[PDB]
Amino acid sequence: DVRVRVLPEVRGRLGGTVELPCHLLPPTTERVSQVTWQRLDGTVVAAFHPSFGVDFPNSQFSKDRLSFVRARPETNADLRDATLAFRGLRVEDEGNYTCEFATFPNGTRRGVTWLRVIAQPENHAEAQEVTIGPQSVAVARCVSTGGRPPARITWISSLGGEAKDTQEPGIQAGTVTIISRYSLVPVGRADGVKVTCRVEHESFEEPILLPVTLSVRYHHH
Amino acid sequence: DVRVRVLPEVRGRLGGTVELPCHLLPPTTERVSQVTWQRLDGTVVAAFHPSFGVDFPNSQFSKDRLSFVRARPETNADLRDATLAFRGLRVEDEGNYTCEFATFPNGTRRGVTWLRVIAQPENHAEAQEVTIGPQSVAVARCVSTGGRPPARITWISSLGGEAKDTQEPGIQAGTVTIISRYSLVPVGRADGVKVTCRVEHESFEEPILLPVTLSVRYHHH
Numbered sequence: 001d002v003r004v005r006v007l008p009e010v011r012g013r014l015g016g017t018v019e020l021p022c023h024l025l026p027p028t029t030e031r032v033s034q035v036t037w038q039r040l041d042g043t044v045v046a047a048f049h050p051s052f053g054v055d056f057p058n059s060q061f062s063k064d065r066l067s068f069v070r071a072r073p074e075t076n077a078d079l080r081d082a083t084l085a086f087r088g089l090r091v092e093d094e095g096n097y098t099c100e101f102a103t104f105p106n107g108t109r110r111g112v113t114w115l116r117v118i119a120q121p122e123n124h125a126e127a128q129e130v131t132i133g134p135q136s137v138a139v140a141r142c143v144s145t146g147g148r149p150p151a152r153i154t155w156i157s158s159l160g161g162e163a164k165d166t167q168e169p170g171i172q173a174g175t176v177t178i179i180s181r182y183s184l185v186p187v188g189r190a191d192g193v194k195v196t197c198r199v200e201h202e203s204f205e206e207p208i209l210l211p212v213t214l215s216v217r218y219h220h221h
Numbered sequence: 222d223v224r225v226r227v228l229p230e231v232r233g234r235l236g237g238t239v240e241l242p243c244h245l246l247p248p249t250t251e252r253v254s255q256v257t258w259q260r261l262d263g264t265v266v267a268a269f270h271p272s273f274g275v276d277f278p279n280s281q282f283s284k285d286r287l288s289f290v291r292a293r294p295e296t297n298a299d300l301r302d303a304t305l306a307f308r309g310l311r312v313e314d315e316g317n318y319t320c321e322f323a324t325f326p327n328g329t330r331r332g333v334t335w336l337r338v339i340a341q342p343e344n345h346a347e348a349q350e351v352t353i354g355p356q357s358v359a360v361a362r363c364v365s366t367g368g369r370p371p372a373r374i375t376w377i378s379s380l381g382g383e384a385k386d387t388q389e390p391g392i393q394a395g396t397v398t399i400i401s402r403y404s405l406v407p408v409g410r411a412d413g414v415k416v417t418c419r420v421e422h423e424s425f426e427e428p429i430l431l432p433v434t435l436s437v438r439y440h441h442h
């Protein structure tokens with residue numbers, strides 16, 4: 001664990017590419033007989049051996065998607081970098097992967113990396129044009145489609161309305177669409193009031209603000 | 222697990238020698254990059270590599286005590302037998318050991334062996350010469366000294382006495398001595414009656430019977 005260096009967590013976009021670093025930290029007396037990357041269940045996904053070469057023995061993780069990032073002059077003996085690159089990320093690839101150097105004589109040293117597959121959702125917001133009334137109804141809704149994980153939506157308002165939302169699977173498996181409706185008792189003096197939809201997500205370094213201006217029918221400036 | 226063949230349990234006498242078999246079962250596509258034997262905590266105790274040779278990197282388990290049992294013509298490439306031999310067994314060596322072949326490309330396959338360190342106890346039994354009385358007392362005792370694990374003692378009798386025993390550490394750490402006293406109300410008609418001490422233990426394929434004949438003072442044939 002302290003001997004092997006990896007990222008505890010790595011993020012990649014669904015359909016895109018990541019890299020999972022892995023290095024045997026020097027100084028070390030040890031010698032490396034082989035390195036493999038395994039899933040949690042122990043299934044090997046990538047293998048490297050100083051003589052037998054490199055191999056991706058699993059059909060879910062072929063050479064067409066996985067590969068080792070060499071950063072040596074094509075002539076490395078010592079052999080301490082096992083950085084694994086992926087392309088065409090799928091939902092199935094999500095998981096914890098073990099980078100395991102088999103060394104001699106003091107055995108296998110291992111690091112674990114959580115590979116998180118993420119899907120950036122599309123967001124939009126709309127005012128709902130309502131009529132005056134006692135009936136507290138939806139005056140706005142925000143929609144985050146195809147996120148992974150699910151996007152988080154909140155509202156920002158000086159008025160006093162409750163927000164409530166619901167979920168459905170997105171077009172793509174692994175992805176989910178969240179719909180949030182802001183509701184309050186529609187009084188005529190509401191028309192024109194700005195109300196902001198706030199959506200948080202991994203693929204956004206800064207939360208997205210989708211402002212909306214309320215619309216009360218038969219009443220306008 | 223199903224790929225590696227080992228004994229689930231092996232027994233060796235304290236101060237003596239055992240062997241822990243381990244084989245990579247054929248047929249197998251795989252190639253072996255190295256083999257090691259580990260304790261439970263992951264400490265390597267024996268290591269073997271097709272180029273770098275053999276090594277016993279741990280000071281608790283030196284080459285003076287451990288070794289690999291080769292059964293090949295000094296010219297084996299394939300390399301599937303990792304049988305580990307021990308001598309001078311100690312109490313400390315008790316434990317579960319993992320035989321782990323690092324193979325390519327489908328990773329490390331492993332078998333687990335419980336190494337049980339056993340000490341054969343010395344047993345003896347004596348009649349206690351008692352006097353008639355209401356006082357239910359000890360008329361016999363059986364003693365199993367220096368067993369590991371603790372020996373089990375029971376009595377065999379046609380009379381109606383209770384047996385109760387006690388434990389103390391033997392001279393050797395890891396070993397325990399059990400003392401069992403058979404007691405009953407000493408009536409004069411008991412003298413001469415055979416009563417057998419039965420002691421069970423691992424180092425005995427058949428339970429040991431130590432007969433005793435009861436002795437009531439001031440009363441004899």
Ligand SMILES: *[C@@H]1O[C@H](CO[C@@H]2O[C@@H](C)[C@@H](O)[C@@H](O)[C@@H]2O)[C@@H](O[C@@H]2O[C@H](CO)[C@@H](O[C@@H]3O[C@H](CO[C@H]4O[C@H](CO)[C@@H](O)[C@H](O)[C@@H]4O)[C@@H](O)[C@H](O[C@H]4O[C@H](CO)[C@@H](O)[C@H](O)[C@@H]4O)[C@@H]3O)[C@H](O)[C@H]2NC(C)=O)[C@H](O)[C@H]1NC(C)=O
Pocket residue numbers: 043057058059060250251326327
């Ligand atoms: C290294 O390990 C790979 C094995 O993976 C581990 O062990 C294997 C045996 C599995 O138990 C796996 O779960 C473990 O993680 C190993 O790959 C295996 O190679 C064989 C043949 O080359 C494949 O068997 C064939 O499988 C398909 C069905 O597979 C589909 O479903 C599974 C999920 O359930 C997916 O993982 C696959 O990607 C597929 O989508 C069968 O159609 C096929 O049947 C054919 O052959 C048999 C005769 O035996 C006939 O009865 C049929 O009519 C067909 O002709 C096989 O059963 C196996 O899928 C494959 N595993 C993977 C992950 O690709 C690999 O070969 C090893 N390499 C070396 C060098 O040791």
Ligand SMILES: *[C@@H]1O[C@H](CO[C@@H]2O[C@@H](C)[C@@H](O)[C@@H](O)[C@@H]2O)[C@@H](O[C@@H]2O[C@H](CO)[C@@H](O[C@@H]3O[C@H](CO[C@H]4O[C@H](CO)[C@@H](O)[C@H](O)[C@@H]4O)[C@@H](O)[C@H](O[C@H]4O[C@H](CO)[C@@H](O)[C@H](O)[C@@H]4O)[C@@H]3O)[C@H](O)[C@H]2NC(C)=O)[C@H](O)[C@H]1NC(C)=O
Pocket residue numbers: 029030105106264278279280281
């Ligand atoms: C392969 O691994 C072996 C290490 O074992 C794993 O990692 C080691 C570092 C330990 O953490 C162990 O618990 C793990 O299982 C490794 O063996 C180690 O080698 C060093 C030096 O060669 C040893 O350090 C010295 O230890 C003694 C005290 O050890 C006694 O107690 C322990 C139990 O707590 C027993 O296991 C031992 O058998 C002993 O009975 C110290 O006296 C000594 O101090 C001296 O040196 C320091 C300077 O650093 C000074 O401050 C002092 O004044 C002394 O001059 C060291 O601290 C370590 O015991 C030893 N482990 C074992 C099991 O023997 C081995 O070297 C590795 N081989 C390769 C090729 O990588």
Ligand SMILES: *[C@@H]1O[C@H](CO[C@@H]2O[C@@H](C)[C@@H](O)[C@@H](O)[C@@H]2O)[C@@H](O[C@@H]2O[C@H](CO)[C@@H](O[C@@H]3O[C@H](CO)[C@@H](O)[C@H](O[C@H]4O[C@H](CO)[C@@H](O)[C@H](O)[C@@H]4O)[C@@H]3O)[C@H](O)[C@H]2NC(C)=O)[C@H](O)[C@H]1NC(C)=O
Pocket residue numbers: 094095096112114
């Ligand atoms: C891969 O492994 C990583 C990290 O390593 C593994 O998990 C460790 C915790 C431990 O078991 C290690 O041995 C092992 O290697 C996993 O990371 C964890 O992921 C879970 C979610 O599955 C997180 O749990 C969450 O913790 C939050 C507070 O910090 C909390 O808000 C969450 O609670 C809410 O959501 C759940 C519903 O999912 C609900 O039950 C709650 O009541 C509440 O609404 C939740 O408990 C851990 O924090 C993660 N650990 C770390 C260190 O980040 C990862 O899940 C795993 N991935 C896969 C695919 O297996």
Ligand SMILES: *[C@@H]1O[C@H](CO[C@@H]2O[C@@H](C)[C@@H](O)[C@@H](O)[C@@H]2O)[C@@H](O[C@@H]2O[C@H](CO)[C@@H](O[C@@H]3O[C@H](CO)[C@@H](O)[C@H](O[C@H]4O[C@H](CO)[C@@H](O)[C@H](O)[C@@H]4O)[C@@H]3O)[C@H](O)[C@H]2NC(C)=O)[C@H](O)[C@H]1NC(C)=O
Pocket residue numbers: 315316317333335
């Ligand atoms: C090494 O590991 C072996 C077997 O493998 C390991 O343990 C398995 C059970 C499991 O955890 C595996 O994952 C792991 O690899 C251990 O074997 C077990 O040893 C214990 C004793 O520590 C046994 O437990 C006993 O079971 C008896 C009935 O079958 C029962 O009579 C015993 O109960 C009596 O004694 C205890 C006091 O010790 C008391 O608490 C009870 O109330 C009662 O008086 C006792 O529960 C298991 O059966 C063993 N398992 C097998 C499959 O044989 C081994 O202990 C371990 N050795 C070391 C040094 O760690």
